[PDB]
């Protein structure tokens, strides 16, 4: 529940993209894919996850629109 | 630890660079960041170090601000120009450091509060 998904970016833009979710809460770490367009953030708190969550379907630095989900990877 | 140093009070149009000193080496930082919160407004990114080391600007202060670090001291710098009312808010840290492949620890510091009239 402090954790989310955000994906839909290339390789190049993920440092770009996390600095933006940065903004919403302190994160205590982040776990980036090998291949995918997609990384699992943890937040402090519920009310955080829930602010990065509502930029789920928003554009980023103009040309990057952006997906947000509650993160689902157990391991993770 | 990150502790950040250097704010306070300054008149419209002056300067004022903060500072920003790690405990631990951070010469591998994957990005680092300084971000302020003027009182009831959202935190925004003002200044980025992106992976590779190619920089981020708030649009609000493009040409007036410069994130840099030096490895040496493990310090890393916002040097602030021309400063507006604006630019009112606490100012915090961010440095992101590679632990296994794939996951990544982040540190915060405290503030430093910088104000204008």
């Known amino acids: 529940d402090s954790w989310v998904t955000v994906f839909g970016f290339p390789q190049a833009s993920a440092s770009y993209i996390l600095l933006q979710f940065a903004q919403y809460g302190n994160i205590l770490k982040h776990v980036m894919s090998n291949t995918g367009n997609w990384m699992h953030i943890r937040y402090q708190s519920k009310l955080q996850a829930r602010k990065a969550l509502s930029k789920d379907g928003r554009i980023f630095g103009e040309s990057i629109m952006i997906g947000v989900k509650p993160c689902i990877d157990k391991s993770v | 630890q990150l502790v950040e140093s250097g704010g306070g009070l300054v008149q419209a149009g002056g300067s004022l660079r903060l500072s920003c000193v790690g405990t631990?080496?951070?010469?591998?930082?994957?990005?680092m960041a300084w971000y302020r919160q003027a009182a009831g407004k959202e935190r925004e990114v003002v200044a980025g170090?992106?992976?590779?080391?190619?920089?981020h600007y708030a649009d609000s202060v493009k040409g007036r601000f410069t994130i840099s670090r030096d490895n040496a001291k493990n310090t890393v710098y916002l040097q602030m120009n021309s400063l507006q009312p604006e630019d009112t808010g606490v100012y915090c840290c961010?440095?992101?450091?590679?632990?296994?492949?794939?996951?990544?620890?982040?540190?915060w510091g405290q503030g430093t509060r910088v104000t204008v009239s």
């Open positions: 961010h440095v992101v450091i590679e632990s296994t492949r794939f996951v990544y620890d982040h540190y």
């Open positions: 631990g080496n951070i010469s591998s930082a994957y990005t």
């Open positions: 170090i992106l992976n590779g080391g190619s920089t």
